[PDB]
Amino acid sequence: ARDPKHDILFEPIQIGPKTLRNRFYQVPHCIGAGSDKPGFQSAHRSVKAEGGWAALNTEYCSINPESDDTHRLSARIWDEGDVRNLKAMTDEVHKYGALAGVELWYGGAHAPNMESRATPRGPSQYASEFETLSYCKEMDLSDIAQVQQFYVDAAKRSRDAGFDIVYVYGAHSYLPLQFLNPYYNKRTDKYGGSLENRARFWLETLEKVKHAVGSDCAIATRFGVDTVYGPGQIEAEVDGQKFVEMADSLVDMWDITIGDIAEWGEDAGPSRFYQQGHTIPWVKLVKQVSKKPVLGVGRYTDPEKMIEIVTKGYADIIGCARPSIADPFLPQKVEQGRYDDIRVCIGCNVCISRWEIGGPPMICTQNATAGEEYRRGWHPEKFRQTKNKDSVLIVGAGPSGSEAARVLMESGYTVHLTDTAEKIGGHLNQVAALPGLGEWSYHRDYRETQITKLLKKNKESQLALGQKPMTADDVLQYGADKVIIATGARWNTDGTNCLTHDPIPGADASLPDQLTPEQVMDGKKKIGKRVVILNADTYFMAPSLAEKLATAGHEVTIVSGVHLANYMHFTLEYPNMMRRLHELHVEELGDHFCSRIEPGRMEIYNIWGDGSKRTYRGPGVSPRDANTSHRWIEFDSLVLVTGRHSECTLWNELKARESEWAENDIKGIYLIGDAEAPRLIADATFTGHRVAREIEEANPQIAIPYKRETIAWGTPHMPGGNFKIEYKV
Amino acid sequence: ARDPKHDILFEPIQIGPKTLRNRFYQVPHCIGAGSDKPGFQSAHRSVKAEGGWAALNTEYCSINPESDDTHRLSARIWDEGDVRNLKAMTDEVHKYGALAGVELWYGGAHAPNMESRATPRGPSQYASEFETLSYCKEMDLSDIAQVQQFYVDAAKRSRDAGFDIVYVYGAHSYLPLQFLNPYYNKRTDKYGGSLENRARFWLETLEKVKHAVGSDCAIATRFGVDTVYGPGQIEAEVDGQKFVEMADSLVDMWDITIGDIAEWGEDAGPSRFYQQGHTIPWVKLVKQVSKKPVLGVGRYTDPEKMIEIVTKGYADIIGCARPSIADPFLPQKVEQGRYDDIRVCIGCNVCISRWEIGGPPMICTQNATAGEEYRRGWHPEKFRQTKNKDSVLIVGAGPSGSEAARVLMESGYTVHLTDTAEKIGGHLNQVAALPGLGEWSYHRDYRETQITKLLKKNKESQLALGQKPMTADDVLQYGADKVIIATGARWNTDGTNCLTHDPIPGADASLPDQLTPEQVMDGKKKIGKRVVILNADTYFMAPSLAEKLATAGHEVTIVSGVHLANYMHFTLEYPNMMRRLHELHVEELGDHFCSRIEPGRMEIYNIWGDGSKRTYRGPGVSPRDANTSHRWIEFDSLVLVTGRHSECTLWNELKARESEWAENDIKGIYLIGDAEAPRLIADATFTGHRVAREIEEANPQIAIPYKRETIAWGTPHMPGGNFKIEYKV
Ligand SMILES: *c1c(C)c(C)cc2c1nc1c(=O)[nH]c(=O)nc-1n2C[C@H](O)[C@H](O)[C@H](O)COP(=O)(O)O
């Protein structure tokens, strides 16, 4: 049953001329879709429609080629081709009976424009503190009118397109905010200086937009009421409130955030430094001056926390991004009181990783159909159920094999899931024990919860933890019709890395002063005063261990032969990770690899130590001047973080005797998770999702094709244009 | 007319079943188009077809979703949608009586596969030394059969798609090379170890591909004969020749490069460390051993150097890429001995900078239409002539106005080009005067050369150099019909950067210990022993200056508040620019910005000094713990590299008086190049390309729409496929 305290959550609300069925709102967020992947765009929001979110929005949407985000992908609404492709989504959000917003964006010099080549305009000439090579032109007054018309234009085309909501997107430090904020705005004419100068641009723009589609579409704005930068940018209690005050008659809805563009990690809080509701203290302050509907994200996945912020008159509605990617159905689950079925977004930000890399599609570590709803046509809550009696053994119940079973059992199969560990989760279990990552548990937590639930519903199906590792004999004699090995990967023992692809001589972590991140993480093996983490890994492992050990008070140097924490730049984690390693006085030696380990001693080298000029030096002979900077650093205990390898020992074995599966009634064995290859957690979890959804194809071991959304020669993006080559002569 | 030494160059050559008209052929290279931009692909290759090149290739072309390079773009030949889409270009190469090649690609784990999410295979389990989180699974021997299949399936569809040439791509360290090359191959079986095993993989592959389309299609290999690593990886005189030996019977033509993946710069040599023919030593060794046609890139632009390398039997053919982007017509310009009309690629590698960021189109610093041949139908050698007697004043003869001149005059306009510099070229004049960048002059060299010849043909046109800078009133009373201001930008003088967008306290390069990048390059200002360069810019200025000063024997520390030479990463400049800064004992202080300059001394700070824990702290205070890292360093002379700004003074003047333009018979004034806003040279040059082409539209100052290559809803990529959502249930 729905706990009736949550009723509050299903009460409509008025937003201008528009009505939100309920409180659950998907704010604008990218997905790797834009106007360019109209399949993928429609499907992924429409399931959240069907899932019962109230309003769904496109990601930030460009009003004009002089705000082009390439290499990133944004959405666009430049022409009637765009109004085509975005309408696919509106119709589709419509048929389920919520609303379609579209987020009107121009971002000035934050748009590098690498496709459109055009020149970006701003309040003042600057160069982006994010695309640092990309400068704007200073708008004169005629530039102020032409760009504003831009939005108008774009607001019209938004209505043709079928949007029920339009925004003047003023967050993450894009145009309207750049005017407002003195950081950017060095104008001394009437658009600058006085608080009502600064906000004229936006104030104007808002009005123009209202005038434009005001009577058919609610105009909302998003606004970044505090920059969390302090004095010198927007402060909520300085410019923030006041601005709210000056706008309020224009807005149908506020949509609130804090942060800029360069470290929007602060909006999209890592669970590694932010909890739920993080934003609230600055969220709150907006109701205390607005007389209008106010929502404001903050990784709100808990309906308890949801009701708090409404019954305490801190928001009116619930703004979500990530959590809607995790679980497009999270509302109808809350409406249906199905509390345990809710897939909790972990704050891992892989989802922001893809978009932030420039091009690839979003993927997600809980929701493996995210990105997969058009092109693979996987629905997150409906599954093809089997038309046989077939059964599956799954070895190992980590991300990979646990999704494996989740999906299969949801598919109706008969499954036996076994692992040698005592609990569901494979290596997530240590991972979540690293400082900060405690909310990454959630990913086995949800699995443990559903397999348990799935077992009462399949009667043959079986969970078995605490088992004796399986052998290939147990396996061939097991009686599953099919077998999924999902046995994992371990840190490399031997200094094997991405640079050399061979072992570091004198690396081996059976020796007393030499650790893996398993041994550091198990907590048994003893750890010397002086530590050196030898790092070949660009993702979280290294920094994190660093944090751990430092906080346990060792003296810490990371030797890095790769750019440390590079991945993290992309999950929005990097700022606060660095500041953090600073704070704990963690020493970083970059651009530095290692050539032999000895007790208490390792030989390290700068990777740009070779010679700058390349000569044909004949065979047997380096064609640079050789690298002469190697030097010997000591350590109590060395922690290798060099690479990882697949544990495919059993699968080696099962493969070797693949000749006996046929007598054993085994129709196939498939490899998945880290055991095929070391992958993201997300990607681990997909490979399970896949073999499952695909257990019935010829070779499940390999994916079947998926829709591709790429252009067909002889078809005009533009309606009724010439596809043909056409030179201007 | 054609110096007859050069006829050699137009002598046809046999390649298996296929005939090359002449010895000018464009090897495989990326443009940012692949399968996804078939207008673009077709056109950009067709005009090189029209221009006389004999065989044109697609860029690296994917055989299968488990080699996807997203977020990079490569081509695809995965199904019918692809065959259609690649067809357009083969049809279009064909109409000019040239060949169409397609380079068949598998990458193994250098394919991050972020679109497809699939798992890539190799000879051995590794993690790419490039895409460091992306690992492959190790082929069993069925794996070995499956992958080769792929090549075959792909090579048939190659044929359906209308290609004349099919490669087995083995360069830059992709799959084939990954077997052959022990750095990757750790197999102990019949695929591994001996030389005969290591080539097995390629060897079979080539076979089956020949068996597959051998009859209709030239089978090419591209092969990396030395990795330019030394022993341990491939050496020419070790396995290189020996490999060529083994293969020689299958291969209709060698295509030789040197280098790996993670630093392929060495193949695509920067003119800042490679001169023309740089590859030869290792290129020539191939002939020694081969009985087949051999070509081998080395940025050949010079027909002399061209005919050196054939007569010396070092090559049989001429392979370019870059020069082919530079001048699609280069050969019909050799052929027509119109040597002064050939646009020499300067080896700035900006072209490879877009592909390498991953997603954007290529663009080029000498050729403004590259990329621009489909979606804006600009042809590199054909201009829409003017239908009036209008005249243009252009103020400033730099990349941007000089390109503006060159195109306008080519379009029949009467132009008068004024610049207070002595020589055509604006800032590139200094910039070519940096260590290594001597080959960048070519980019003015070529326009001085065409404006001088255009004058002769357009008799009232005029060039005037060494003039008094124009004033607002000169311009008004100048009588041009329209005016182009192309006045430039300058390094910023007061410590204005992209991190505060404010000037630093105590920077001013009127003081005798503080210099700008112009002052430095001029060689006038005296510079003291110890130097700090305070860098905000992520391109070549800083490092270059460092290079020069150091080699002037000052003592050198780079302070950088951004990541130094980030761009150069993407030009493939970075490694050798590092080892160079290394060899010259140049000091690097990164993640360090500055808050105060005094005479002899500056106050710098760690950008990760602030605290990690963000609390709401009320207005007017920092919400992190404040930064306590500030500390003073000394210098004799300080070099500001902190940003740049637009010289827009004249323009702010002419527009204040826009009122009096009509009185003065001025229909408009348009602003371009750095003066509108600070941009690469490429871009600055494009801006001038653009206002020319478009001198006759509404508002020149703003570009017209170009065709876009995005999918239109309801049209399937797949022939006869379903565009509509369809979930699997
Ligand atoms: C892209 C990505 C995937 C993420 C997850 C967020 C995001 C993305 N693109 C956005 C954009 O187009 N415009 C915009 O205004 N916001 C965009 N977002 C951020 C999102 O809307 C939220 O503000 C944050 O994720 C924080 O809230 P929450 O997800 O914790 O609920």
Ligand SMILES: *c1c(C)c(C)cc2c1nc1c(=O)[nH]c(=O)nc-1n2C[C@H](O)[C@H](O)[C@H](O)COP(=O)(O)O
């Ligand atoms: C892309 C870019 C634009 C550059 C010019 C080189 C290049 C690019 N993409 C390639 C890819 O598709 N596969 C491949 O094997 N090589 C690729 N290259 C290299 C190009 O083929 C040449 O090997 C070098 O550029 C040097 O040639 P040159 O331009 O000096 O004549």
Ligand SMILES: Nc1ncnc2c1ncn2[C@@H]1O[C@H](COP(=O)(O)OP(=O)(O)O)[C@@H](O)[C@H]1O
């Ligand atoms: N012999 C096997 N039998 C049962 N479990 C195994 C066996 N080999 C490895 N495991 C288990 O496999 C799981 C592998 O998990 P993990 O690293 O998280 O891989 P993945 O991330 O892809 O799921 C672990 O819990 C480990 O206990």
Ligand SMILES: Nc1ncnc2c1ncn2[C@@H]1O[C@H](COP(=O)(O)OP(=O)(O)O)[C@@H](O)[C@H]1O
């Ligand atoms: N006021 C002026 N009158 C004449 N020439 C000018 C004037 N102001 C600047 N210039 C010229 O403008 C050119 C600007 O060119 P440059 O900085 O190279 O711009 P870009 O990179 O856009 O080509 C410089 O060569 C300088 O000659």
Ligand code: SF4
């Ligand atoms: S990738 Fe992680 S943070 Fe993002 S929506 Fe998914 S579970 Fe949430």
Ligand code: SF4
């Ligand atoms: S960008 Fe530079 S290296 Fe490239 S084709 Fe153009 S001139 Fe050549």
